[PDB]
């Protein structure tokens, strides 16, 4: 998971 990548959130930016
Ligand atoms: Na990912």
């Amino acid at each position: 998971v990548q959130v930016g």
Side-chain angles (χ1 to χ4, degrees):
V1 180
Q2 295 169 321
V3 178

